[PDB]
Paper text:
Thus, TaqCad1 is a dual functional enzyme mediated by cOAs, both as a ring nuclease in regulating Csx1 and itself, and as a deaminase to accumulate the level of ITP. TaqCad1 assembles from three pairs of monomers ([name] dimer) to form the hexamer with a pseudo-D3 symmetry.
The hexamer containing a single [name] dimer shows weak but convincing densities for four bound ATP molecules, two linked to the intact [name] dimer and two immediately adjacent to them. In some of the R/T ADA domains, there is also a corresponding disruption of α21’ despite their [name] domains do not have a bound ligand. This observation suggests that binding of [name] to a [name] interface not only activates its linked but also the adjacent ADA domains, likely through the protein network formed by the ADA interfaces I & II, providing the molecular basis for a sequential conformational activation model.
Residue numbers in the entry:
A (entry chain L), D (entry chain H): 219 to 611
B (entry chain G): 219 to 612
C (entry chain K): 219 to 435, 444 to 612
E (entry chain A): 392 to 435, 444 to 469
F (entry chain B): 470 to 547
The structure:
């Protein structure tokens, strides 16, 4: 019974302790997954309402109506949400363009984004979430990057107060730095000053808990990421999370762990190919952020297989290796899946996956989260509220 | 019309122009200096209402008039503000313990501090001021350093908008990297991060224009500050001023100019010892900001000497070497002297200083201010209104 | 129920769960701490038997009996498990000069030293131990530091195979690279290169798991160490700078801090050290004898022992013995004197220090599964009658 | 009379002041500009007698006439000095091949290049000149770079002492480190060491006032410059000037102002592209030295336009932004025109340029010059004799 | 040989002036008496002597007043 | 590269230093400090290629004799 992830999970009927050790079914477990207290660690604010009804619930709430960019017709590929072929990384980002930097440069639209994203998290029974936003991308002449960030924190804090304590998703903000750094260096340290300042203005509720180092994928940005002083952010308590991904550079992942002191690696899909890096990423406690739907639509993986293979999703191999893996959503709108759908899609990507393994990902996520001693004492008290199975056999 | 700093002093009557070249009279010219549109560059906000009737008025404005610390009795040296013998900076910095860290943590006391200070700036006819504040010292559990800073800016911004354009003193903010109390890399990283964010939150009115690198005296405070990357400060447009008082350390001034890229030197009273450093300061146009009363009280100088001596005030020596010298007040309350008084003391401190030297120091200050093109155009328009003399009869 | 660190403490009768939350008895619980499966993370090989009778046993079975330097004179301070006053560190080092570099720079003696130390670990019911050695300190003109290290590993490896698997104490080596503030810097280079080479040589049984740092309390010297999967632990004893623990965590990439008794001074270091999982190695007897702490106080003051404060803050605190012979106290004794130093320490906290050590050990996946299973069999209480 | 650059312009009658604010006429103002006390801050010694009669005058005074290189065929592009199309830097550099480090290696020819150049400076009524030379390029087996530098300084000093004080141009020397790509980084060390030695040797008359980083237009010598430790040249009182490379890079300029402590920038024609860099350059007081003819022939700009544009000469944009802009001649021989000719071209390159703008540029040059307190007090006394207009209406 | 002596927090201009003088004199004279190297009476500064090595000047370290192999 | 090897790697031998004569200062430093230049004739010919069976010393000729005449310690290897 010691193999169980949660201490409260041991004191169950013996039948359920055998059900949890049985492979998860992606069709009949939609109700059990839909009630699990979940943790979200890789969520982008810009890619939430990128098309559909949500894209018009935000545009109808704009402060000024006549300034919104006209809705362009971005054709979602066929087979979507599950494309028959990968669409690449560049096409994946371009899919969500009716939101982000063009729709949320408005007090009204940005408030519909924060408020609509919180209800979606509550609809998925998420107990903790680190939302990744770029305030510097949304700043107009009158709206400073601090004004934008100060409103995002206040909108989420307002949502967290109107809900009861037991149905309350605790939202924390990660500040991402990407895109513009390829043409300047002032922005890389202009964005690290917000985090240091934002990490001190607020001490309770919604807080800026870390700095998200997007742009670690490119090579010139990586030149400026190690050409920047990161000790000031380390002293102030901010944690560092990095985007790995298409660039399959083992040397890049090595520098982040030991030069930037990164505590989480995003989209580390090619980590098993280096056996020496896997151990270091497994003994030091580094948490890997995996996104099932967002990786199938950008890289492609075999679905509905029978036995493990050479191009299988690395979720199973990481768990055996001891790596602390976590399943996330990446882009709730640019993709079409909630945190429940992603957890269910890891039964057609990873053959033989156990239901208890789905619970371990929410225990690893509950330890990788950049929360304090108070936030992480109410998160574990909510993961112990896992619902009893509906079938049991 | 050969060597005239202000260009409005060219259609100047020859009788008055010759009067401009005569030595300044400390007692008679008090009325003329009082009407001069001056520039302030070294003014510590927390040393304004240190004692006297001004200290009390900051204390009935307290939002919570029960947590106010008691009034500690801090006697002044006899003969203040002109002490018989210099008291040193350690004793000097303790005279203003009734205001500062204790007090100014109440939101009401800070608002009175900012508004009362602005009133004293209009009384001296100051056209541009750069107040040095440390928001990290007035912060509490419910008041972060950013909240304190945003309150200080909005108190000065309101006062600016309530004044006519022709009689308005434009106030800017400098963030001070504190003395030996500072030096921790977790504290100098917070001070610079706040300055970078505040340098961009505001683009009109009262603004944050630079960081004051106090504690340069401490040898342990150095090399924690040379170990921090000041490049992001320079990229965002923040100017660096170094508070180089209370020693002759020639190898520290050399590194501030060329490593920290500092643009102003505070209390550089030993520049004449190193002629090589004096040429670099004069040629590169680094402004040396001198504080007459604060220097006389802290370290002492001869007064009313007939001829220039070895220990004489270096104000005229700096001017002869083409150094952009500026005269400031340092601490309005602790020193117990206004900007007008500081200019008049130069006659006693520096023998034979002409009335054109005083006007030159104000032109030097206008060039050394951390002001953008919009504020410079307004400051230059105010410096062209030189008051007409009254005693041009000898 | 979701507060015990092992999913086996929960499924007990109600009274046992109630006896754990009571303060640990430093007398009655002697028979129960002795039966606990402990984990040792701060043990020095050069201080096992520095005087007494075990000095003779190591001295008896040398291989060059005409070389053994004569026994010097070591006055133990008054009583000494527990000194009346601190003796300092530099004095504390010289309390064990009858054993170490001199005696162990002889093939026969070094066999006894590793053979006897493993004997002590078994008697204490230790399921895991990371021993610290300095092979370059035992080298001669015909016994290179590699030869010394290879002998040490096989002596521990031989003992492990001679003991049954149920009672086996898995031992791993931890090379100590000490910063000579006056001495030559080559021995820093030799030790690091020796650990980088030993990392790949052995993959089963006794292994060289990491490098220890007695000094710098060196950033560029440790980049190669991190490539080969070696974990660095930094001594943080004498001196009281925060900037040393601040550059050990983020420049040397340290994963364990030894004798860090002044973390509470800084309020940001405690959060960082308690949010990244950095473990603090504490030695009750060694810290008491070196620096001195109030004992038997009925309340927690300003100078009290920081174990309970660290535990409240979430810092992963382990309890160790540092030097066995020099301190003259076993792991159970160190685990019992903590009650005297820390008033109100519950007996579940003592169980907490062992779980934290299990997560702090430099063992691999296979090593951890044997260590975790062995910790599952927690001994049932004996004196539960009140 | 509150923004007049020169204090002596306030005493003018209030009828010429109206003329002073009118746009510069490049045809009717030839006589007025020719009598203006001018300042030359960018003038290469090796590109003066590159062709024409001046080349043969220099070639005729050689001490070793048998060693004179043959006069090669250098065809100037058609339409010179106003090329029909830009000819580029590399082609522009090769126009001055009949003069340079071929004739100047002869001690006799060096006198002609140094004494004829001074005679061309008095024709333009220049009150202060900063000639930049590379003594290491004219060295021989029996003539070290220090020997060449002594002759250059003493040839200009002799001419300076044979001219009246109210008619004498004060010539100062700048040493150029011309970026040998990798093969010779000892040339940079040799160049900087020569400047430091000469910075203390002479304290009166002609002096070595600074070092010219003409090699900043590269990528490996820019890296060589950025690791050269310019600290010693800063302690001996030497100023630093940097050639803003033809490559449109902003990261180089940011390091020239804050890492090399440069006090001037040469051909900084792309400062407006970064609005944050133009603000720092305008506030710190860095002087941008612009050559109209050298820029119109190398890069090419629209001429005689009736209004501004997206490709117009950046003189007006820099002046409006509060930047210290100076007009120079660069290579006075290769460009085939004088300082007076360059000033009148701004009426064609920059439409609407006023006659008070050219006066401002001379005031900017007088403040950007690397002169001491003695040479500056004599330069201002010469700039106060502004010639009275000959038209007035 | 030109001696570039580090001072106890004294002057730093002479350590650079002597190095520049040595670099110039190494190329100035090629017969008879010559400047053949620089003497370092301090640091016993690694970024201050790259120009010395790039020109072929030999350096001799003038150790003293200490017993340190470092 | 030959500069950083000598003065930053503290090299005592240089392998395949066929372009030493391009920098007279570097050649003089190598000769004076006694740094040995190890040359491989067949490997250099097969990789770089040099004229063969000439009668005089050309610009592209193999740099052995030039290095020996300059006082450099040259070694021939396989
Ligand atoms: N897979 C990825 N790889 C690299 N960068 C990514 C990736 N996914 C998101 N980003 C970065 O995340 C940043 C934040 O995206 P977000 O969804 O919050 O909207 P946004 O900033 O408005 O987007 P955009 O930059 O596309 O207009 C974007 O700048 C994008 O550069
Ligand atoms: N060297 C200095 N460093 C920092 N602040 C200074 C200094 N000299 C004067 N001050 C004033 O101190 C203010 C912040 O510090 P604080 O008000 O606590 O003063 P203090 O000198 O530390 O002591 P006190 O509060 O007793 O006056 C600054 O805004 C400035 O007004
Ligand atoms: N508790 C400690 N604190 C600091 N340094 C220590 C400590 N214990 C040992 N060292 C250092 O580690 C080395 C000794 O390690 P070890 O105890 O394994 O061998 P030893 O037999 O005691 O050696 P030696 O006789 O050379 O001291 C020496 O550098 C000693 O300074
Ligand atoms: N416009 C320019 N941009 C960049 N570098 C330049 C420019 N003009 C000249 N230089 C550099 O200045 C160096 C010295 O120029 P100068 O005219 O004084 O010498 P020179 O005798 O003409 O030299 P050379 O024969 O090598 O061209 C030239 O070698 C060239 O490297
Ligand atoms: Mg010992
Ligand atoms: Mg030429
Ligand atoms: Zn992300
Ligand atoms: Zn001050
Ligand atoms: Zn040039």
């Amino acid at each position: 019974i010691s193999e169980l992830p949660i201490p409260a999970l041991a004191a169950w009927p013996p039948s359920h302790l055998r059900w949890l050790h049985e492979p998860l079914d992606p069709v009949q477990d939609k109700a059990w997954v839909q009630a699990l207290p979940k943790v979200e660690l890789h969520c982008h604010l810009g890619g939430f309402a990128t098309h559909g009804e949500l894209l018009h619930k935000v545009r109808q709430e704009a402060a000024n109506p006549e300034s919104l960019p006209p809705v362009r017709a971005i054709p979602l590929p066929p087979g979507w949400p599950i494309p028959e072929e990968p669409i690449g990384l560049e096409r994946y980002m371009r899919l969500g363009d009716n939101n982000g930097s063009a729709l949320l440069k408005d007090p009204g639209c940005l408030r519909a984004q924060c408020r609509l994203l919180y209800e979606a998290l509550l609809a998925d029974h998420v107990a903790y979430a680190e939302i990744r936003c770029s305030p510097a991308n949304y700043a107009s002449a009158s709206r400073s990057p601090w004004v934008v960030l100060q409103e995002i924190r206040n909108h989420f804090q307002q949502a967290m107060e109107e809900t009861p304590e037991d149905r309350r998703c605790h939202v924390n903000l990660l500040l991402t730095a990407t895109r513009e750094e390829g043409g300047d260096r002032s922005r890389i340290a202009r964005h690290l000053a917000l985090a240091i300042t934002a990490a001190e203005h607020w001490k309770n509720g919604c807080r800026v808990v870390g700095v998200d180092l997007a742009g670690f994928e490119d090579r010139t940005t990586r030149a400026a990421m190690f050409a920047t002083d990161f000790e000031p952010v380390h002293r102030v308590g901010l944690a560092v999370t990095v985007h790995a991904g298409e660039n399959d550079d083992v040397e890049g992942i090595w520098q982040a762990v030991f030069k930037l002191s990164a505590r989480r690696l995003g989209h580390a899909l090619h980590l098993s190919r280096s056996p020496d890096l896997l151990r270091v990423v497994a003994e030091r406690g580094i948490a890997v952020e995996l996104c099932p739907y967002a990786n199938l639509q950008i890289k492609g993986f075999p679905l509905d297989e029978e036995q493990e293979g050479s191009e299988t999703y690395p979720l199973r191999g990481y768990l055996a290796a001891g790596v602390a893996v976590t399943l996330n959503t990446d882009n709730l709108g640019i993709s079409q899946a909630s945190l429940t759908d992603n957890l269910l899609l890891t039964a057609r990507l990873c053959p033989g996956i156990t239901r208890l393994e789905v619970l371990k990902t929410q225990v690893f996520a509950a330890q990788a989260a950049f929360a304090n001693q108070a936030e992480r004492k109410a998160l574990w008290a909510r993961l112990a509220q896992v619902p009893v199975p509906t079938d049991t056999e």
